[PDB]
Each structure stands twice: as structure tokens, then as C-alpha cells.
Amino acid sequence: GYDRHITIFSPEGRLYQVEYAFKATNQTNINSLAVRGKDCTVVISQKKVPDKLLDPTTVSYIFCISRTIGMVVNGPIPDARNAALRAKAEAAEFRYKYGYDMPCDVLAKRMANLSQIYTQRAYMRPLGVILTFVSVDEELGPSIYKTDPAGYYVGYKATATGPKQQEITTNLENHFKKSKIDHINEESWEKVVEFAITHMIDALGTEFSKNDLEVGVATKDKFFTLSAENIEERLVAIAEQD
Amino acid sequence: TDRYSFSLTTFSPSGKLGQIDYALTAVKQGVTSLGIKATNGVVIATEKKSSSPLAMSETLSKVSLLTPDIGAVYSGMGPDYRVLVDKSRKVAHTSYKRIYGEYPPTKLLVSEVAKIMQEATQSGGVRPFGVSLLIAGHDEFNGFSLYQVDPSGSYFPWKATAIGKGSVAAKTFLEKRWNDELELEDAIHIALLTLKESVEGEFNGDTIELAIIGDENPDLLGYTGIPTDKGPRFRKLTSQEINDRLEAL
Amino acid sequence: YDRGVSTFSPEGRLFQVEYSLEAIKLGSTAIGIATKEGVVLGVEKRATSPLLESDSIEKIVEIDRHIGCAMSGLTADARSMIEHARTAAVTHNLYYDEDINVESLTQSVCDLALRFGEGAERLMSRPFGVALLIAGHDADDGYQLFHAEPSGTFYRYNAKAIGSGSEGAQAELLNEWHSSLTLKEAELLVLKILKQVMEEKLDENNAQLSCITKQDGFKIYDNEKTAELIKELKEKEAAESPEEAD
Amino acid sequence: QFNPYGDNGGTILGIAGEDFAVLAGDTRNITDYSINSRYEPKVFDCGDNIVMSANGFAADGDALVKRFKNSVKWYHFDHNDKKLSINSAARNIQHLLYGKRFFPYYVHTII
Amino acid sequence: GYDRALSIFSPDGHIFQVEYALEAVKRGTCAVGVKGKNCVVLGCERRSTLKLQDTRITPSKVSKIDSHVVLSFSGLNADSRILIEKARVEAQSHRLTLEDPVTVEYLTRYVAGVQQRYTQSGGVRPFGVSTLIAGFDPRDDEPKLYQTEPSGIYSSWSAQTIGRNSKTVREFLEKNYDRKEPPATVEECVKLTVRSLLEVVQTGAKNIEITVVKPDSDIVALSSEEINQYVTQIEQEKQEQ
Amino acid sequence: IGTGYDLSNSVFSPDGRNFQVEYAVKAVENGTTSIGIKCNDGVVFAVEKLITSKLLVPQKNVKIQVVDRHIGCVYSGLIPDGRHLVNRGREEAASFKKLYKTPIPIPAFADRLGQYVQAHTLYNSVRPFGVSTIFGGVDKNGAHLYMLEPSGSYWGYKGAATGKGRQSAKAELEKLVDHHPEGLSAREAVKQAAKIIYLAHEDNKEKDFELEISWCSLSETNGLHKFVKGDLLQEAIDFAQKEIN
Amino acid sequence: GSRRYDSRTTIFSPEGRLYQVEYALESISHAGTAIGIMASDGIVLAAERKVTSTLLEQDTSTEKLYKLNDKIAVAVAGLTADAEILINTARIHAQNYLKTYNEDIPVEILVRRLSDIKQGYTQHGGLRPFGVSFIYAGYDDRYGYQLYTSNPSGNYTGWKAISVGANTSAAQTLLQMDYKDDMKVDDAIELALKTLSKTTDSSALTYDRLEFATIRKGDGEVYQKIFKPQEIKDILVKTGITKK
Amino acid sequence: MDIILGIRVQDSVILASSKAVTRGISVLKDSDDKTRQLSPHTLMSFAGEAGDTVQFAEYIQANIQLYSIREDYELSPQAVSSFVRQELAKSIRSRRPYQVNVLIGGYDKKKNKPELYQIDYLGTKVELPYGAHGYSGFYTFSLLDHHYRPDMTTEEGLDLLKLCVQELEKRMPMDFKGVIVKIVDKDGIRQVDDF
Amino acid sequence: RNNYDGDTVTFSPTGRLFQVEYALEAIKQGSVTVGLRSNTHAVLVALKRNADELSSYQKKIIKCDEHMGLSLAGLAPDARVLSNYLRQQCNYSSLVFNRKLAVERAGHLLCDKAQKNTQSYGGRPYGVGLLIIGYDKSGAHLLEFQPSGNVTELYGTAIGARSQGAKTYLERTLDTFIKIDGNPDELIKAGVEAISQSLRDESLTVDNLSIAIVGKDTPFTIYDGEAVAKYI
């Protein structure tokens, strides 16, 4: 009947709109990877610009929420920008009301609670987006916390989201099982970027050019995104490795 | 515009509230959690089923603190439980502590959470909560108490029980194993035994969460100088303690 | 119920409006005739039992001393409309020290007709289920008779019948009306048309008459004068022989 | 404190004869012991052969004149261009003035 | 908040919710009202006669709106309570603003208007109640009896009945009521009322509840023994045939 | 599994689509052609106006709207929805200016419109916009051209086109981007826009059309949005008429 | 938009019934059995717990019998949460009447307040009705001992002895067979216990599956006694239902 | 102020109220009944600001009559006094409070006892054997403190009230044009024809 | 259709709003009216329709301001609502800015007012088409407004039943009536001919004909009754 249309329970105890939003999260057909370094945090995403009439500088799914928090979105760009604006407003309001910058996990929990409110109320529809917040929290160090359209959120040593998410996840798992540590033992953030790009090339099995990647880096008290030429330099360094 | 002002949970001709039963169904598919009341404390326990080993299971807590003497665990939908714990903390602070200067007793806090959930089952444009809650608390005039709250908004006091997938098999195990003279460590051991059945993967301090409402811990108060202020009764066990007690199973 | 209350049909009409028009079709009979000597309003009381005191059937109401109204259909709804009319009339006096024009009163009444729907100022759920014949006199447009429907539309009729016999009655009205019609002639004409379209034998207990004149204003005829007019029309029709059989 | 009222002087006069009326006013608009303008008329024709003047506070007088002209416009709109009776205009002006019974137009009005 | 249009028009020109409320009225206990030359009698039917029922506290079918107006109903009891409360409040308000008790016609019209508003408002269903309002105007000896239906229509009646089996009782009343000769005495009115009720209440006299209204606020409820006297007297005449 | 996911806005289908939004896009595709071209110092917008009859007053019935004094917007699809969206965008720009003094930057205005539309695709009580809007202008960071779809999705383009002949236009634009890496001039962009409108008119060649061109250039219009009129309009029309025939 | 999903909880059936009222009454019929009996010298309330488990702390459990004030108590049949909402509102109304008039609330006034609340839920708002039936037992100086009942329909009535919940037909038959106007409180207790034991869906009545309450006059002051587990077990073994 | 006096005698309550209402320097009326029958066994005399008095009195009367009709029962005098006190205490902190003082006299039939309550415009209620509002008490109380006796008869109470009225007419600056005297007992409310 | 024509908030799979089209059909099933302008005048000729022969002829031309008026075709109440809104807007212009509201801006306001109803749940599009004539600081203007929200300026047009005859007459007579500058009676005669080009089994009479004229040195005036006998 109509238990498939709004956020009410099916006889099996499931919410079909949540599942369909989850399915919609992959509409962009882009894979994103996130890893923690020794003192930084890197996020890589596929930049796919099909139309040449497009301004390639405007195509991005990574957002600078605050001076410290970055957020990469898997899902349509309307809901992506909606979540981005809401998260920026929440971070600013938190900074104003409580006197310090909003933590990564706190913003993630706030967005997950909002998604849960969408999960229980009828007039609000879920947002077909998966949100990965990354930062270097002053109390927790490198932090990666991810939320989904179900209101669920959790933190990772390293994570991946997208159509081929299982492959990248298994790759990272194997690497960490071999290293027996929960981070990329490297002092420079450029090397962690190179590690992430290398392992994404290994998992997805495709070569990238400078215009095929978005690279966000979060260091203590800063979150930025690399330009095309910095990504090209990282790809050159990767190609010159063994 | 929220035009959904009508009830989404109505009575069927068979005298059934469909959404309530469907929430109970969603609860039954949740991971098993359990609670056991002893003579000098209560114990709540559940399995920390992570999605991927890349995920840090400690960052997500199934056992949460409501008041320094009242904790809670759940079975069902994680996000509903999280927002319910937030609402419960806020209602315990506002609707009691800001009025009487003391934290609410277990029965009244459970009643408030039950009111919230019933409003979720009767108000307009909303579905019932897809969780079942086991709340273990301690107050001075009622002692220790363990309550269960269902999506229907009803709550019951249990000497010991469990909810989730392997609830029945767990509950039977508790009936043959429980008595009215158990000490706190006995309840902890029985909880670990009952949980070991309803778990499929590894069974260690990093895959299980367990909290106790036992003695007052003044070392966890953070300040000294007030003799009338003793430590909290709620304490989550560390993975080291869980594994130490597993080593003697 | 699968569509909205203010939904358009593929033909370009409002469903609830047409349904209320049908309800009006199922209503009692109300006929008005306007002449240079005044306007006459006659209604069928339609008492559903002999024990019902026929006096308590007030289907002709006074909006003001110069404006009278007859109702047809779900008469209950008309109550609210009548109030909105009466107050409005007196208010136009209070604000302007003069009588409100008949067309202005009718337009103000019609302004409520389409004030229905969902959303929300909250509006009523359904349109009115009653049609109105509003008769009056002002120094601008003389004697006037208006038909007001729950469609928000109002017309001005020299003579109009609404209700059950409203179709057949209307035809005979078109055949029996002229610009030189007098007041007594209009009274007897309303009586005759009512006697034709009424299922019951018309007497002074199941029919009610009223008239708006410039002199005496709006006056509702009592049972005795109405019965005398009924006897007069009986004598007129019984003593008429304009036939040519051979 | 801010004083919301002021006096611009002026004088108006109204006479009614057999088949005519006359409303006259001085064209001097002043403030305190200074002249603002020597020709600022305040006796206006509103239509329907109705002349009005609200003398006193210039702002309130202008506001009332504009409100009455708007009222006659809407009275023509809503009543089939019916001529506004002089007594009807007087009643409507009474209601306009009493609308601000507790913040009055500091003007003496004559039509 | 909730403004869903529940009472709307049907393609044939019918407001279904109103008719279904009338049907709910047809399922309620019977009530009857009769006008005399100087008194009004209201009779009501008791749901069979249960033994575990406490009759001292259960609300009666006849409720006073003021000292001089009474109200009987047929249909849903809760909607009747709502209408009775609104009517009593309006009676006190009319006393307060007019310094004169309300007329039966005015109270009847108020109740009818309330019901009509409930048939044309959003988010609400019409009243499943039909009402019989009886009494005497202040300082007036002329009896007053009115009826209102869920549709909002109100009308005066020499004698009327509402509820289940009201067709048979209305036929009996149309048969045994002479407008030229209304029951001159209170006894005649009560006898006609109890006879009309016994035409449908096959059970005993306990099922009959009679109240009599007389001018200057003279409202008295008849005892079960008086009802037994009336039923025995009418039955003995029937057997004579 | 099931049916009825397209009868209510904001309802996700089992595949993960908002069918009402795609129906609005289809409604857009039924509209006239409108294009935008970003040159080196500004942007030029052009639109076709289908002449339903000779009774229409020429040069009237303007289709391109202006926001603030530097933003131009042209919308293909349901004209009333585009007018409403332009009104909301003007309100957003007025708020931004009143609070921050500076005129609203083009990307900020784009994001404002996008959030408005995305909100309009969030509830079953509001219909998604039935128009695709090509807008832009010159701000402190140079020229910006954006296109916004009924889904709330918007992007920055070197050139954009929507409507019936969009594909035709989308072809010609792709030529220019390839043949002018250095960038077009404002006047040359106006001529190319006239040409592209004339070419895309063939997809709706049934009735005759009227060309409407506006532009916002840092040097030609000093950063202000102005309608191309008079001699420059006739030059662009003659250029297009010569290139097509 | 949202019109397709509205169940319209407050609409009439073609016969003239309230769908949700009847369905909630069915849900209540599927609930525990509660019996109230009024005697000449007191009133008794008895109720059967449908939740049956040996691991249920029956001591600190009160799911069927609740206190409104100190002179009025309620036996509930149906959804416990809606019941508790109505109980809180009823306590607040009683205390408001006390604060206003400085007199204890008459029973019928509270009963009619709750019934009007229920009806309001069965006429406007488009919300589901309360799936709860109440048995009120009270004492006021006007009518003395009083036993009332109310259902989701918003209708309320009075009784000498009445039952709500499951097996109400057989319970009413037994009560009507064994009731007398001159019974005492102990006779009423025995009758309620026997009716519950004969209309129970379990093996036999035990203390852990019972809630019991008595409102008495034993001095001139009324006592509202909620029975404890041991008191219930003792009255059970004394009436002969059990043995120990 | 106006003369508002009350005395509680064994099996009766007597209330006296000035008959004069004066606005400005002119006595507008000399036959004003400053009482309202709240119920057949409960009467209330009132005095205070012009307008507020009769408004509050008739409002209380309407509410009490509505309660009496709704329940077919008469509220005890204690309950009516508590209701009026709560109304006044809610009024005092409103935008425009009621400035009315009331004496409530009633024969409680369930206790078969007379009761008299005094409440000022603030909501301070007291049960007294005798009470007064305005300046009147400043004299009458003394007399009562000397002449009151619990086991008095209704006629003795009337004589004591006559003494109070004489003292007021002797030592009061205002001419209150006599008083209306009413008695509330088990048989209801009556008005002394000649005082 | 059946699953997409219940609300104005539901798009058809082809991208159509059916309620809007149903309102347009409600317009098409109304009395015929025609408007035509030159460079100095603007005329509305309306054929009022009656229920029967005992009924009046419902008014079709409404005055909005001393320089601007409109003619209706379809639902009379929606026409009254829109005309009252337009009166309010012209009045606000004159009072706040001492300015006559431009016809183009009036059309914009009406278009936005309709678009408000064609996108929100719990509301219907208006059920009337409008023809607006007005003389402003830019000369004479004629606008055609449909409740879809589309308003267009034309030298001449017509709406109602069989409006195509009048439209084609104007299409041919364009070069002729656009030159009727400074002659009101000739423009009125041209409008009467245009509306006669849309008659089937009927003749124009003083009872069914309404004229409206606005222009330079000519306030928006309405002619009914004997005043139209000079054109019959």
C-alpha cells in the first residue's frame, strides 16, 4: 500500500523511503575514500566532469564546513548542498553559543539526529546523501565520522563510500591488517594523500589524471582542498614510486 | 508545511495498532540485549556488532548514561535510541532536577520516556519508535530497579529479562539461572553467559558493552569536599575488565 | 474523497458547486416576481408531518426593512448567510447613513459562497447547500430580484423559481410575465405556479407569501390574507373559459 | 521626548446658502514664528460636489484628506458609481476620525 | 491544525456524514415529546432493564438546560453531553447579557446552529444526536416543543418522537393527537405519552421515564410507581377492547 | 516493487528517483530555447520568443529578467514559475545587500536559488519548479554563468542551453569552447548567441520567432546588465541570418 | 498531497458507528479482565495481569489499578500508556477542582471530564482514540459509594457491579447471578475473585497474576487500600482458591 | 466607601448594604441593592469601584448558577467563597484588576450552619462571626466585640445591626440613605421590609 | 490523466498541470469578449450572457482604475477577486508614489498572483481569463491573461467561446485598426465587427452588449443600454 511512500513501518518493520534514499546516494556514480594519517586526515573523491560546457572548478562534492571541519558528500548535489549549508550554520551557531569550534563527531551526531527526525516524521523526506566529516579534533586527533540517511553515524579509522565501496573497504582492511596500526604512519600529509590515491587506484583499477580527483586535507586548525596542480604533483610522485 | 496532522497509527478492525506491532517486529530483528537485577546492583549488557573492522566500535555506545544513578540499553534502531536518550536526559533535568534539586527516580524517568513514546504512537505525522529499552536505575526510596519500555509506550519491571533476536533463548536461560540472592558479580557472570549464546562472532571485551548500577564510585565524582555527595552508581565496564571476567568463564 | 474539495472537473466546473446545486434541486420551491409595483416572494413550506406546526417554517426572512430573502435547499446553512447579510446591511447604514443597495447586499452575500476549501484564516469545508432569492428596493435601480447560488455567482431576474419545480415553474413564468404586471397579479401568479409545482394541495398552511414595496417595506403575509388570495385565485381559475373545442 | 503633533496655523470657513455652499481657507502654511509657504492649499475638491478641509496639523490633515478621497473612490467602486450623499460623506468622515479616537487627527474638519 | 474536510457534498447532492449521523440517531433509545393545553411531557426509553446497573447515579435522558427548559436526545450520549453543556453555558450567558431567561426557540436555534457549524467545519464530524427541547417562555403559559436534527434543521411540533422505532410512535401520535383538543390535563398528556411509548417499549414500565414541564419553572420527574399506575390503567382498557 | 511513487512530490521511487522532478524537467523540455555564453569579461544571454500570432506587440513581452543591477536570468519552461523564482532571487539579493552592503556575488545567488528549489523538492505539498534557469553576471571575481534544473541542481558553465533546441545549442556551444580557448568578446558572444538561437529555432521551426538578447560585460556594459537593442541587435540578427542562410 | 494517507479517524460508518471506537473496543476486549463490585460498606476492584512471567517484579508493578486522588481509584483495561496519560490528566483535574473549591472532587465530575476528553478525541483532531476502558470506584458526600465505567466512545455509566476487558459476557452473567443489593465488602471480594477465577484464560488464579484494591469507610474516613502480593496471596488462600 | 456589613447569628446570616450610590456631588440613587443571590442559600454583598462591582457580582452569579444547573446541586458556602477568592487572586495580577470587596453569607445545609466570609479585592478570605468592608468596620467591630454573643437569635442580630446603623449614621461623614438588610437561613433568603 | 488530475501540485508524466487546463476550459466555455487597441485608444467589447430570458446579463467588464480596466471570461467570482486585487495595486501605486500603475506591471502582478495558486496544495487556479485595457505614460495597452500565469501584450485579441473568428478578423484588420488614432467611435465599430465575427445563431442587442473605452483625454468608461444603440 502506502507504507512504501512515507517514513512509516512496513509489516516487516522496515522503512522503504530510507532504503530508497540509500539507493539514491549512489546516483552520482562517484566513489570516495577517507583515511587518517599520523597528524592529518585525507579524503579523495572521483571528479567526473562529463560536459565540456561545464566549468570544472564549480564541480565538487567536498565542502569546507568550518575552518577545521570538512565534509565529503556521496549523493545528488541538491541534497549535498542542502546538508552543507545546514552543517555550516550548525557549526557557526555552536561556535557562537558555546565559545569553541564545533567538533567533528558533534557535528556528525547533529546531522545524524536531523536525518533521524526525517526518518520519523512524514512531511520531511530523507536526504539521499552519505556525509563523511573529517578533521583534526583538538581532543581526539585525526577524526573521520560518517552519517547516512537512516540517522546512523559512526567513526572510522578509515572509510569508503560509493558503488565500489566494498572493494576499497576490503583494500584498506587488508593494508591495516598487514600494518596492525589504525593510521598511516607518515609525518607529511602529501605522502598520506599519495597513499590514499595509490590504494584507490589499486582498488578501483583505473588510472587518474589531475582532473579526475578531488583531494581534501584536514590538518590541525585547517581544512583545505588541493588544486589541480598539487594533485598532479602527487600523481607524479606516485608514478615515480616503485 | 506539515499537513500531516492526522494519526499515522490507527486501530485495525482486528483491534490491532499496526505500527506498534511493526515497531515490535523491527525490535525483534535487533541485536540481543539483556538486563539482570541483583541484590546489590543491576547489570545491562549487549553485543557491539560493528559493521566493518575499519569502524571504531567504541565510538558508538549502546549503553548510555541517563543520570549518575540510571543507565539504559536498547534493542532495535540505533538512531531512535540515540534521540530517545537525548530526550530522556533533557526531561530528567527539566521535569525533575530543576524542580526538586535531585535526579529523578527510575520509575518516574521510565514513565517520562514512556509518555514520549506513547505520544510518538498517537501524535500526528509520526511513526512509533523502533526500539525497546532496558533501563537500570537506583534511587534511595526504591533501591535498585530494572524496567523495560516497548514502542507501545508501556513499561514493566523485570527481575531479569532480554530483548532482541535471541531474547527467548536468553530469557529461558535467565529463568533457570536467576534467584533472589545473587550478588553483583554473580549477575555479571550470568549476563556474560546468557550473552555468549546470543552472539555469533568473536566474544571479547571489544565486541560487548556492559554497564552496572552498583556501588557509589567517589573516584568518578571529580571533586571532593561534600560528604553528602557520593559517587555515581552507573559505571561502564572497560574492555580489560570484561576480558578478565571472560578468562574465568 | 480521492481528490481535493476545490478541484476542477475536466469540463471546467467545481465539483462541490455542482453537487450543492443538485442539493438545491432537491430543495423546496421558492418563486419571486418583480414588477414596477413591488416584488413578491412565495415559498413552499413542505411540512413532513401533520403534527409539525407549519408556522415554524421560516423560509422567508427579512434582511432589512427594504430587503427580504427566500431560501431553497438546505435551509440550515442559510441561517449563517442571513446573519452576514443583516449585519452587513445595518453596517452599511452605520457607516453611511443610508440604505445599502440591493446589488451591494447580494454581492456581499455572494462573497461568502466560494470562501470554502482546505488549507488556511480558516474557511468552511463545503459550499452552501441553499440558494437565495433576494428581493429589495432602492432609489437607484428601483425594485430588484436577485438569485444567489453557492457558486459565488448571482443573477438579476424579473422572475425566478428555484427548488424542485424550478424547471417547469420557470417555463410558465416566462409565459406569464410582462412589464405591466401588477402586484396582485404577481401574487396570484406565484400562488398558481406554487399550486402547480407543489405535490400537496396548496393552502395557507403549506405556502408562505411576502412582498417588498417602497411604502411599507418588506411584509410577510399572514395566513388569513394568503388564504383570501388563494380563494381569489381559485375563483379566477374556476371561472375562466378561453377554450375552443369544436 | 518626540512630540508627534504640530500646529501649522491656518483658518478655514464654511457657509451654506440657498442652492450653494462655499468653503474658504487661507493659503499660509507656517510653523512656530516662521512661514513655510505662502500658497499651500488645504480646501480640496473630492468629487460628487463635496469640498473638504481639515485644518490644524498639516500631516494629519493631508492624511485625512487622502483617506476620505480613497474612501469615496472605493465607495464608487463597490456601489455601482452611486453618488456619495453629503450626509453619507459626513458619517464616513466621523468614522474615519473616530478610528483614531486614542491618537486623533489634530485637525478641525469642515466639509 | 487538522482541517480535513470530512463533511462534503456527494455527486447526488447529499452530505453523507449528516445522513450517517441521522442513522446513529436511529440506533439510539427512543424519545418522545407531547404538548398539552398548559404542560409538556417528555418520555424516554431505558435500554431494556439490566440488574447490575446503578440507577441512582447514571445520567437520565432528560437534562435541564435552565430552570424552565428541558432537553431529551436520541443518538450518541457523548455528543449529547457536549450539546447540553454548550446550551447551558449559552443560557447563562443570555441571562447575563439580557437579564431575561432564554426562550425555548432561542435555545433551540442555538443548538441547531452549533450542529450546522459542525456540519460545515473542517476537521470535525457532525453530531450523532437529535434533540427534543421543551419548556415555557418566561412569564408565558404557551407550551413550547422543538426538535433539532444533526443537519441543523429545527422546527416546532405539537407532538414528536426521535430515535429507534420513531416511525411507529409518530404514526400512533398522528393517529391519537387532535390539534383541536390537546390533552387538557397533565394526566391525559402523560397517559398519551406512556401509551405511545408502550407501543414500542414491549418491556415493562421500568423502561419508561417520564418528566412533566409546567409554566413558571415547574419540572417534575415521575416515579416508577406512577408509571406503573399509568401502564396498568392503559392495559386494563386495552384488554376490555 | 509497487506502483504510485510518481503521484506525490518528494516520494523516492525504489530505484532512487523523484519522478515528479523528472516530470517537471519534461515540462521544461517543452519550452522555448534559451542560452547563455560566458565570455572573457562577462556573460551574454539569449532567448527565442515563439510568435503565436501577428497580434502580439513586437519587442514587448520581455522574457529575460534582471536581478539587482548585475544579474541576468532567462528561464525556459513554465514562464510563471520562472517569474516566481526570479522574485525570490531578488528578495535574496536585497537581503544580502542590506546586510552586507556589497551586491550579492553570482555564486552566492546561485546557491540561494538552488536551496530554494531544493526546498521546493522536499514536500508533498509543493510542486517542483517547472523551469530551467540560465543566469549569471559579473562580480568581484569576474564573469559567472550558471544553469539550474528543477531538481535544485545547478552548475557553472562556460556555456549553457535549455529548451526545445537545447541540443542544437548544446552542440554549437561545444564548438565555440573548442575553437576559442582564449575566450570570446562581448560583441562576438552576442553575435554567436544570435546565431545559436537562430540555429536552435529549427527544432521548433513551426512558427516564427523573435530574438531577445541581454548581456553583462565588465568593459562593454561596465558590469551592468543591459538589454542589447538597436544597432547592435540588428548587427547580431544580420550576422545570424547570413550564417544560417 | 498528504490527503491520500489520512485515515480520517473521526468519521461515521454508513450505519452510524465510529470505526476507530469499535476497533479500540475490540483491542480492549483482547486485554486483561477487570471487575468492580460496589457493596453497602465499601467498593472492591480486581484485575488480572495478562503479562505473565516468573521473572516479573510483581512487587513494584501497578499496571491495572491506579490512584486518582485519595478517594477515587481506577481499574484499567487496554493500552497502559494511554491509560497513564489519562490518569495524569485526571489527577491534575482533581487537584484543580480541590484548589478552586477547597473540596474533594465528586466522582461523576471527574468521570464526565475524562469521557468528554475521549469524545473530543472521537469527533475532531483526526487522531486515534484512547484504547482504554476505565472502572472508577469512589466516595463523595453526595452519592456515597459510586462505581462508574467509561469506554473509548466517550460514554460513561454507573453500576452496582461491572466488568471490562476480556470475557465480559461470562463475567457479567456470573455477577448478575450472584449479586445482591445487601452484600458486604468481603462478599464482594469473594464474588470478584470467584468470577475472575472462572473467567481466567490461565490455569488458575495466583497472587502473582492479580491486582486488588478496596475503598472502605472503616471512624468515618475512607481508606484506599492497594493490596500487596502477600495480602493477595492470603486472601486467595483464605477464599479457598489456593492453598498454603 | 459604601456600607457593607455582615453578622453571623445562630442559624442565620444577616447582611446589610447601604442604599446610596453617589457620583460626583449628587446622590444618584437612594435605593440600591448591593447584593446578588449566588444561590438559594448563598448571598453576596459587594462594594468598590463603580462598574467593577456589579460586573464581578453578576459574573460570579452566572458562574454559580451554571454550576448549579450542570450538577443539579448547590455548592456549599465554603466552596463559593473559595471560588470567589481564587477569582479575585487571579484578577489582582491581571492587566486591570477588579477592585471589589465582598461579603458572602450562606446557610450550609449539609452542616445546618450559618457561615459568613469576608474577601477584599486582593483575595484575602476570612471566616468571621461579623465582618465589614470599607470604613464601616472601624466603628462596627468595636460594638460587636462588646455586644456579640454566639447563641443569639435572628431578632437579636437585627437589633445589633440597628445599633451599628445608628452608630454609623451618627459618626460617619457620608449619608448612605439607610441600608437594605437580608437574612439567609435554612429557608432561603428574605429581605427585612422595615429596618 | 485519472491519476494526475486530482491536484494542482501533481505533474503529469508528460509534464502537464491538468487543473490549469481545466480552468482554461472553464474560460473557453464562457461568454465571448474582445479587446483592440490603436495608439490613442483601447476598446473592450463584451457579449454578456444570460441564464434564460427572465435573467439579467452578467457583467463582464470591470473598472480597476481611472486609467485601466478589464473584461472577464469564465468564473465571475475569480474575476471579481482578481479585479479587486488589481484595484488595490493601482490604488497603492497612486497613494504611495502619486503614480499611475503601468499596465505591464499590473500584468506581472496578476501573473504572479496566479502562479501562487498553480503551485501550492490546497488551492485551485483561477477560473477566468482577463483582457486588460489601459492608457499609461507609455500609451495604450492591451493584455491577455490566462490563469496558467501567462500574460501577453497584443494589439488585439479575444477570449470565450468561438473567439477564433474575432481573432482572425483582428489578424486581418490589424493594419486597419492600429491606425484608428484619435477616433473612439471607429475603434468601437471595429470591435463590434470583430465580436460579430464570433456569433452563431445570435444578433447583438443593447441587452447583451457592453462597451469599454480608455485613452488619451478619455477616462476608462463603460457603455451599457441605450449608449450602445449607436452601434447596433
Side-chain angles (χ1 to χ4, degrees), chain C residues 76-77 79 126, chain E residues 7 18 21-22 25 71-74 76 79-80 82-84 86 107-121 124-133 147-154, chain G residues 123:
Chain C
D77 306 4
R79 287 201 296 273
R126 58 177 182 80
Chain E
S7 50
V18 176
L22 281 162
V25 166
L71 174 53
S72 61
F73 74 98
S74 290
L76 306 177
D79 310 7
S80 77
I82 290 315
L83 287 174
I84 291 173
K86 282 191 173 303
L107 185 70
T108 292
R109 181 156 38 85
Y110 168 72
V111 180
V114 171
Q115 298 179 302
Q116 191 275 344
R117 296 187 229 103
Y118 271 74
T119 65
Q120 202 176 2
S121 297
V124 79
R125 64 166 180 78
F127 284 104
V129 176
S130 195
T131 70
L132 292 183
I133 304 165
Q147 176 201 356
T148 75
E149 46 190 32
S151 62
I153 305 293
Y154 68 99
Chain G
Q123 187 170 8

Side-chain angles (χ1 to χ4, degrees), chain D residues 80-94:
Chain D
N80 210 22
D81 283 67
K82 179 181 179 179
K83 196 177 185 299
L84 186 53
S85 315
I86 188 64
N87 58 277
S88 302
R91 179 67 65 87
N92 191 250
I93 292 177
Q94 168 186 64

